[PDB]
C-alpha cells in the first residue's frame, strides 16, 4: 500500500506490464547516472547520498492516475517527510513519472511537472506554512507541502545540453526537505566550497554552463524547471 521505497524495495514496485513495471529499470538507469565514474556526476551530494543508502524512491504511473497518481504520491511524500527528518540529514526522494513518453519535448515535461505539483496541493492535509508566502509571484515563494517548504527540481531526458538533469527516460522529480542544506548555507565557507565543487563538475559533464538563476536568491521557482539554454523566465511567471 506504500509506494515509498528504499533501494532494496524498488524491485517490488512492479514486474512486467503492471503499474510501475517500468520503475525498476528507471531506478537502475538513475543509479548508473549518479554513480558513474568518469566524468563523475556533477552533484557529489547526490552521488554520496546514493552510495550511503540515503535516497528513497517513489513513482507516478500516468496510465493509472486514480490509484498510482497524485493521491498516492501525497501519501508517499508525507511518509518521506517523516523519514527525511528522522534519518541522516542529507536524504533525497526521487520520483519517476512514467511510463516514458517517446519524443516528449522539455516544455511538455515541465508542464507535466507543474501540473503534478498543482494536483498535489489538493491532497495536502496541512495548512500552508506561515513563513512562506503563498502567492507564487512573491519573490520568497517556495513550493510547500505537509507543513514546510521543499527544494524540488524536474529532471527529463529532454535535457540535451544540461545533461546533469537527464536522469533517465522519465520525467523525474527530485524532492528534499530544507534540512539537507544545514551546514552549506550560501554565506558559509562550506557552502561556497560546495558550489565550487559542483560547478567544476558541471564543466566536465554538461554542454551548457551553470544557469544564471542558480546565483552568483529570489524566485526559487525558476530553478525548479531550468531551461536547456541561458534563457531566464519572467520572475512573476511561475505556472503554479
Ligand atoms: C539524487 C540526489 C541529487 C541530485 C540528482 C542532484 C542534482 C543536482 C544538479 C543537477 C545540480 C546542478 C544544478 C541544478 O541543475 O539544479 C545540483 C547542484 C547542487 N546540489 Fe544536488 N542533487 C542531489 C542531492 C543533493 C543534496 C542531498 C544536496 C545537499 C545536501 C545537494 C546540494 C547541491 C548543491 C549545493 C548544489 C550546487 C548549487 C549551485 O552551485 O548553485 N544536492 N544537484
Ligand atoms: N539548483 C540546485 N540544485 N540547487 C541546490 C541548492 C538549493 C539552495 N539551497 C536553495 O535553497 O535555493
Amino acid at each position: 500500500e506504500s509506494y515509498l521505497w528504499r533501494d532494496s524495495e524498488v524491485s517490488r514496485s512492479g514486474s512486467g506490464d503492471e503499474p510501475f513495471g517500468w520503475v525498476p529499470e528507471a531506478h537502475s538507469v538513475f543509479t548508473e547516472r549518479i554513480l558513474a565514474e568518469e566524468p563523475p556526476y556533477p552533484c557529489y551530494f547526490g552521488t554520496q547520498g546514493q552510495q550511503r543508502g540515503n535516497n528513497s524512491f517513489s513513482a507516478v504511473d500516468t496510465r493509472y492516475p486514480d490509484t498510482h497518481g497524485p493521491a498516492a504520491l501525497a501519501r508517499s511524500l508525507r511518509a518521506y517527510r517523516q523519514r527525511a527528518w528522522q534519518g541522516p540529514k542529507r536524504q533525497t526522494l526521487i520520483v519517476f513519472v512514467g511510463p516514458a513518453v517517446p519524443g516528449a519535448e522539455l516544455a511538455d515535461d515541465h508542464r507535466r511537472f507543474w501540473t503534478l505539483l498543482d494536483e498535489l496541493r489538493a491532497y495536502d492535509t496541512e495548512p500552508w506554512p506561515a513563513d512562506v508566502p503563498a502567492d507564487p509571484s512573491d519573490p520568497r515563494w517556495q513550493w510547500c507541502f505537509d507543513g514546510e517548504p521543499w527544494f524540488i527540481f524536474a529532471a527529463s531526458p529532454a535535457y540535451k545540453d544540461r545533461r546533469s538533469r537527464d536522469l533517465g527516460p522519465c520525467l523525474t522529480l527530485v524532492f528534499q526537505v530544507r534540512r539537507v542544506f544545514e551546514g552549506i548555507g550560501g554565506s558559509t565557507v562550506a557552502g561556497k566550497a560546495a558550489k565550487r565543487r559542483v560547478r567544476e563538475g558541471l564543466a566536465r559533464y554538461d554542454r551548457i554552463g551553470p544557469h544564471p538563476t542558480l546565483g552568483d536568491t529570489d524566485f526559487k521557482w525558476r530553478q525548479y524547471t531550468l531551461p536547456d539554454d541561458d534563457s531566464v523566465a519572467a520572475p512573476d511567471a511561475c505556472p503554479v
Side-chain angles (χ1 to χ4, degrees), residues 10 22-32 96 167-170 172:
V10 178
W22 49 271
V23 169
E25 188 174 319
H27 177 234
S28 292
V29 172
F30 164 84
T31 68
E32 181 190 32
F96 305 108
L167 290 177
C170 296
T172 298

Side-chain angles (χ1 to χ4, degrees), residues 206-224:
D206 280 351
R207 290 161 40 90
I208 190 152
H211 196 266
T213 65
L214 277 274
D216 197 346
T217 37
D218 287 341
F219 304 102
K220 289 189 179 330
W221 79 262
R222 295 189 293 197
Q223 300 184 233
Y224 300 177

Side-chain angles (χ1 to χ4, degrees), residues 127-206:
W128 188 272
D131 52 317
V132 182
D135 188 331
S137 171
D138 190 292
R140 282 295 120 219
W141 185 86
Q142 298 183 70
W143 187 78
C144 295
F145 185 82
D146 205 43
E148 65 193 72
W150 296 65
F151 190 70
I152 171 65
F153 83 86
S156 164
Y159 278 113
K160 295 294 136 223
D161 285 356
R162 206 178 301 289
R163 299 181 52 236
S164 53
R165 282 200 174 202
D166 170 1
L167 290 177
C170 296
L171 168 62
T172 298
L173 276 65
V174 182
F175 291 88
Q176 293 135 351
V177 301
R178 295 202 58 88
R179 189 190 184 213
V180 306
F181 308 115
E182 199 155 271
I184 59 165
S187 51
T188 65
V189 170
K192 291 188 183 191
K195 288 182 172 72
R196 281 198 295 273
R197 185 164 167 201
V198 175
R199 294 177 186 211
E200 170 184 84
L202 289 172
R204 293 209 61 218
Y205 196 94
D206 280 351

Side-chain angles (χ1 to χ4, degrees), residues 8-70:
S8 69
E9 300 168 321
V10 178
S11 71
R12 299 179 250 116
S13 58
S15 177
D17 194 338
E18 293 177 0
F20 299 155
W22 49 271
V23 169
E25 188 174 319
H27 177 234
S28 292
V29 172
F30 164 84
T31 68
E32 181 190 32
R33 298 296 176 84
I34 298 300
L35 297 175
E37 190 206 341
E38 171 46 40
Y41 188 69
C43 184
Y44 65 93
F45 296 102
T47 300
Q48 285 171 357
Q50 187 60 42
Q51 290 168 332
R52 297 167 190 186
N54 290 331
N55 291 344
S56 291
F57 300 88
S58 196
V60 161
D61 195 313
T62 63
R63 296 173 298 171
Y64 306 113
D66 302 319
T67 53
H68 297 74

Side-chain angles (χ1 to χ4, degrees), residues 80-100:
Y80 175 75
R81 196 199 63 72
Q82 292 288 330
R83 175 177 296 178
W85 279 95
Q86 296 174 147
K89 176 198 300 190
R90 296 168 186 187
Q91 295 178 63
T92 299
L93 172 70
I94 297 91
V95 180
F96 305 108
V97 182

Side-chain angles (χ1 to χ4, degrees), residues 117-138:
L117 290 196
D118 282 336
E119 293 177 348
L120 285 167
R121 293 298 314 145
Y123 296 104
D124 195 356
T125 55
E126 295 298 337
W128 188 272
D131 52 317
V132 182
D135 188 331
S137 171
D138 190 292

